């Protein structure tokens, strides 16, 4: 009763039904280090303008 | 100092957009004006300085030094006017505003609050002044002393502009408001022995010390007579300006570092005032005058008494005059004969005897003579010299000796004996220069009946 797949049958992606559980860390990764803190707020001008030497703006 | 500023800049606009022949009349009429409202600077108290804004200042340092500066200005256009004659007439207006540039430069500099923007102004004076020595100065040597005008000056201001700002850095700002109550004393150290020397050997240079002085005599010799004035009267002093803001945060490394300075101008003054006793040329011999009497500036800086900033002061403005005057003086000599030679023209005194008058007054305010502020200045400084060592009194008294003696010498060689027989165009003297030399003495004599608002800020 075997009957002869047709063509592009074999090349289909299909689901598999396990009861394995998925894997949590296939890499094996170390902690990722923290990202640098964000800054936030307001954008006010520079205090003083510029403060190049004697400029005052 | 927007005041100030502003009118000066207007200058430029005046002479370019002056009638043909009115160049002269319209800058010499506008630019006095603008010296009258200079008066209003003498607005000073008691403690703390004229703080007008954050960039200009005013204090009792600062504001003769303006005065002198403003005055200078019309003085320069009366004295330039006859040799730039058969001048082309955009290069007449172009010289007037070199004139102009160098004024508003040098109200800038000696108002600026902090020290960056004194350096900006203190270097920009530069350009003017090489510009006018080297374009309308009257030889081939004027191309050399430019070059050694431009390199003596930068080889000493670059490594003080390193030192400043490492000084920023450091102490958080320039400002000299900020600087007198932020000052922190200096400690022996061979890093702070190289601060030192940087922050001062620039305005040793401008003074100019003795062993760095031999531009000052190749300028002079090749200037143009508006040249010599600014460069006798004011940019001198910009070194013992500079001096005097700055000893301020050199402290106590001074009290040793000195000694060096000391030594060579306490010796040098009494070589150069020698060296004057054989000058052949009038305009080297009062260059050379020029260098005397600043090395007692430099002395009196270095001691930092509150006699000797007093007697600093009085003989900055008093030297400013007087050499100005001499200047003109030997230049309207020049006018006739063409010639700097001391001993070609002789016995002055019976074709132009009224130049002969204006002769004996400079050069009695020259020697010292008292009460001129030449004097005030003088003994302020060999009182304080005193108190450091007894025994600078030597070199003190034998420097007035050679002083009068070269002083005299010059108006005897020039004006006495008897005259050149052979040199028949001694015109007699204009009303431009007879008004020329008047505006020079009476100034520096009214101020002998004033004589506070030429000390300082230590008075
Ligand atoms: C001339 C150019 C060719 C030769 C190269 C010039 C450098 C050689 C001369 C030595 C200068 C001294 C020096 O190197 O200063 C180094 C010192 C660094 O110390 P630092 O790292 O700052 O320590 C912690 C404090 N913040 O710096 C300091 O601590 C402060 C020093 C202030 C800035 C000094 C600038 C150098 C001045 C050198 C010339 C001085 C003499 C000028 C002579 C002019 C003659 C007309
Ligand atoms: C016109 C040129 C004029 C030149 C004037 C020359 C001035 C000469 C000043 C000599 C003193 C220099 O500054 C001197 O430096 C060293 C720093 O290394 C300091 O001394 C310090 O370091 C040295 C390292 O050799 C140690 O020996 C010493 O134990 C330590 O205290 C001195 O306490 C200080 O006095």
């Known amino acids: 009763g075997w009957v002869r797949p047709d063509l ?50 | 100092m927007l005041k100030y500023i502003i009118p000066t800049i207007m200058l430029m606009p005046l002479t370019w957009l002056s009638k043909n022949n009115m160049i002269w009349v319209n800058s010499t009429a506008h630019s006095l004006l603008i010296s009258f409202t200079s008066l209003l600077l003498m607005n000073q108290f008691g403690d703390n300085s004229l703080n007008f804004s954050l960039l200009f200042f005013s204090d009792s340092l600062s504001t003769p030094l303006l005065i002198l500066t403003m005055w200078l200005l019309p003085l320069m256009l009366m004295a330039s006017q006859h040799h ?115 922050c001062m050997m620039a305005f040793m240079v401008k003074m100019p010390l003795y062993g760095l002085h031999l531009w000052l005599p190749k300028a002079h010799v090749e200037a143009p007579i508006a ?7 004011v940019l001198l002093k910009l070194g013992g300006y500079g001096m005097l803001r700055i000893t301020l945060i050199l402290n106590p490394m001074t009290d040793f570092m000195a000694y060096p300075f000391i030594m060579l101008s306490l010796w040098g003054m009494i070589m150069t005032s020698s060296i004057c006793l054989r000058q052949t040329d009038l305009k080297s011999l009062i260059a050379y005058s020029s260098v005397s009497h600043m090395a007692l500036v430099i002395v009196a800086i270095l001691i930092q008494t509150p006699w000797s900033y007093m007697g600093a002061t009085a003989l900055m403005i008093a030297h400013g005059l007087t050499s100005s005057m001499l200047f003109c003086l030997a230049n309207s000599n020049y006018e006739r004969i063409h010639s700097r030679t001391m001993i070609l023209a002789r016995g002055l005194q ?54 009068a003696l070269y002083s005299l010498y010059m108006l005897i060689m020039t004006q006495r004996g008897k005259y050149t027989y052979h040199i028949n165009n001694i015109s007699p003297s204009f009303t431009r220069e007879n008004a020329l030399m008047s505006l020079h003495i009476l100034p520096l004599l009214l101020l002998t009946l004033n004589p506070k608002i030429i000390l300082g800020p230590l008075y």
């Open chain 2, 84 to 198: 730039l004659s058969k001048e082309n007439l955009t290069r007449k207006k172009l010289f007037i505003t070199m004139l102009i540039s160098l004024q508003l430069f040098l109200i800038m500099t000696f108002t600026a609050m902090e020290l960056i923007l004194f350096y900006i102004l203190f270097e920009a004076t530069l350009v003017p002044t090489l510009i006018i020595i080297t374009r309308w100065g009257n030889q081939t040597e004027r191309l050399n002393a430019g070059l050694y005008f431009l390199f003596y000056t930068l080889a000493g201001s670059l490594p003080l502009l390193v030192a400043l700002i490492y000084i920023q850095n450091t102490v958080g700002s320039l400002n000299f408001l900020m600087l007198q109550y932020w000052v922190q004393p200096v400690h022996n150290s061979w890093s702070n022995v190289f601060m030192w020397l940087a």
């Open chain 2, 227 to 233: 040249g010599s004035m600014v460069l006798a009267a």
């Open chain 2, 350 to 403: 019976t074709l132009l005897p009224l130049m002969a008058t204006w002769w004996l007054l400079a050069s009695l305010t020259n020697l010292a003579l008292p009460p001129t502020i030449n004097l005030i200045g003088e003994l302020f400084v060999v009182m304080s010299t005193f108190s450091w060592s007894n025994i600078t009194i030597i070199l003190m008294g034998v420097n007035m000796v050679i002083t």
């Open chain 1, 8 to 57: 592009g049958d074999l090349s289909k992606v299909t689901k598999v039904k396990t009861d394995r559980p998925l894997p949590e860390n296939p890499y094996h990764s170390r902690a990722r280090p923290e990202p640098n803190p964000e800054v936030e707020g307001d954008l006010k001008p520079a205090r003083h303008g510029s403060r190049l030497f004697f400029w005052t703006m």
